[PDB]
Symmetry: C3
């Protein structure tokens, strides 16, 4: 196997963008679950369809939106590419690399996830302190292939992927919104989906020590870290994954969208305020 | 990656079959381990080689056998396609989908498996109450790719894959055969094989909570469920998988065939009687 | 998927080698981490670049070195092919099969690994008594595909992969070198890399019962066993994999090379002496 892309391609995508916009973003945001709205908190918002950008994986609704969120230069991904849609991981995470070359130095990723930790409840937000990359164990790692040392090393470390500074500086930000539910922290486990877990699979993931399970994010994290970006991320718990054979309930997408729009308020503000904890550059 | 097949192909395979036979099957049966004989309990038996069916994956001995088992309209698969033979999962489970379009509404799958639960013994039959899909965690899920909503949803649920009604209605059926060994129930774990587990791997699968391990079935289950079929399945425990470094014994295929023919009687009758618990349609 | 190679190709590679050298090796050695030096303990050393050998996977520095190590006919692989470089496993393990056809009957494999067992320390050598093949669970097994019974069976066993005789006969050899650190024994877990484990991943691998984690070896083991070779292997623990969020340390490649050259002495001698415990043939 190898990456369909050459260093020149990432480069060429960045230069194209660097000449179709004035924005010089510092922060990449990859939204999942009702952070769709974030668009309207941006100002000086310039949209580009994925379809117009040279080299961009080809989905539908997908766009890059540059602008300012709370005095920070951002680029947000609206719509993303998942492994379960059949993309190889080197297309899943193509954008992260285009970001690094745009000059971005931080990544914020968010997602929906089922809660495996029994404490959690629908609506909780969980900070990601760590991950378990199950597709990665088997070979599905976005860095598989020849390494380009213009991005990073052959063997990067992931023990420190999720910036400790950003995690404290996001706990602070939660107090100063006065919330009833407390901010959660924990391990996100990636699995490839697209079907949902059995009870027995749920039990497996709880025994491994995961707190939430989704079908994204980790690969973009690994590529971010390979590149030198600072990473911060979190999960909206949209459902408590089913764990006994008694329950007549079932995980479904209505539940996930339902919950997404429910936290739409909470989140856009939460992320928007977090912008101020991101140190400027120079 | 994507599926080599278009909705039109599945369709075209079904119509071909629908015009080469009078049978309008309600129940699909996918046999493993000495359910080879089931053929001769069928009546009005019409055979087709896999080789003659348009689009069918291409193996050797493989045939589709339509007919009546105990007053039910069946189609049985004799020989199946495994992941370890190098088939992509969208060929492994092509038949399940052809089945749905033939009008089938139930699936019965069976297989050989090593016993991980220490209770079990060679010759035991275990009902499948749940599975652990290890290839699925990593990306090897037969639904990977664009979803066709003519079969089902993007994100189907698997918490209820194995029909509870059918499982009670199969416990009943066991009493009324007067058996010395009791009917087992449990989690089947799929792994890709084709080599057999180490002791350390055995220990891993026991800690995850599996009761039996085979190299098939799960993918056909996931595709069945995606489609709306009712699913029922079980495993013939052909060997107690090796769990300490003391034993001089080793898992082997003679053991599996040996056991298969040993339960050939038990099983054909057991499945044949189970036919009456399958509610008719309309 | 299938193997790019035909039985004829392996064959053709062996015959080519059988006519470019007088050596008729009995023992294959696949070195990792500062067994680079072993070259100079060989005598009558004949080198071949990978680049000149028909059919050999194509990397850089890679060579086959035939000769005598302590009165045994060897062939050593200097440089090997990893899964994380993007090779399919049937190229990763092409050489093992060329070895079998050269007449080799034993395989010795070594590697670097992170220590998961808290007992271990940097510099320890651990014998491999067993493995956990995580890529294998998911489908990444080098035997995936049609079986050739000229090498072995459809379904070989791995419960006895690591020769018990060789493991005792290597414990002996350790006494008779008078070492302060004792020889370790344990389960090696393969994961695909190339990134290093998170803390949460470390915890997972410890709970599964692994003692060390690397990104090689297992596939060559499975193919060796499929073929009938005797296998013996071990790991140089080059780093204690990070297991709590407190530590400011991080796994890195300098640490691995650092440690490799540190045991270069210890190992070359250790392997060289082990040669005498390998029974001759006939
Ligand atoms: O309960 C769950 N189990 C497995 N995956 C998910 C996710 C997935 N995480 C992915 C990140 O966006 C997304 O595509 C979504 O479908 C949300 N909830 C659950
Ligand atoms: O002890 C075992 N370990 C792993 N797999 C299997 C199976 C596999 N299950 C598959 C379902 O037919 C079949 O191809 C068979 O080889 C039977 N016994 C064992
Ligand atoms: O701490 C670790 N974690 C995961 N893999 C490795 C290895 C890997 N094992 C592989 C066998 O040579 C090699 O390429 C190396 O990078 C050494 N140490 C560690």
């Amino acid at each position: 196997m190898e990456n369909g892309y050459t260093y020149e391609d990432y480069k060429n995508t960045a230069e194209w963008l660097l000449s179709h916009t004035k924005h010089r973003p510092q922060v990449a945001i990859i939204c999942g679950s009702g952070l769709g709205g974030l668009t309207d908190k941006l100002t000086q918002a310039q949209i580009f369809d994925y379809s117009e950008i040279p080299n961009f994986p080809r989905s539908h609704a997908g766009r890059l939106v540059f602008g300012f969120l709370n005095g920070r230069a951002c680029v947000m991904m609206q719509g993303r590419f998942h492994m379960y849609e059949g993309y190889p991981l080197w297309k899943v995470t193509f954008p992260v690399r285009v970001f690094h070359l745009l000059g971005v130095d931080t990544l914020v990723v968010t997602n929906a996830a089922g809660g495996l930790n029994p404490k959690f409840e629908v609506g909780d937000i969980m900070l990601i302190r760590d991950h378990i990359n199950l597709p990665g164990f088997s070979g599905q790692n976005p860095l598989r292939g020849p390494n380009d040392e213009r991005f990073g090393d052959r063997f990067p470390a992931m023990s420190d992927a999720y910036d400790r500074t950003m995690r404290q500086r996001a706990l602070s930000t939660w107090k100063q919104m006065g919330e009833q539910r407390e901010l959660q922290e924990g391990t996100y486990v990636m699995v490839a989906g697209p079907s949902f877990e059995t009870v027995a699979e749920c039990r497996v993931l709880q025994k491994l020590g995961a707190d939430a399970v989704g079908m994204s994010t980790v690969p973009e994290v690994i590529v971010a870290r390979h590149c030198g970006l600072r990473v911060f991320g979190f999960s909206l718990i949209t459902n408590k994954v089913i764990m006994d054979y008694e329950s007549l309930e079932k995980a479904n997408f209505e539940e996930v969208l339902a919950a997404g729009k429910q936290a739409a308020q909470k989140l856009e503000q939460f992320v928007s305020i977090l912008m101020a904890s991101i140190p400027l550059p120079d």
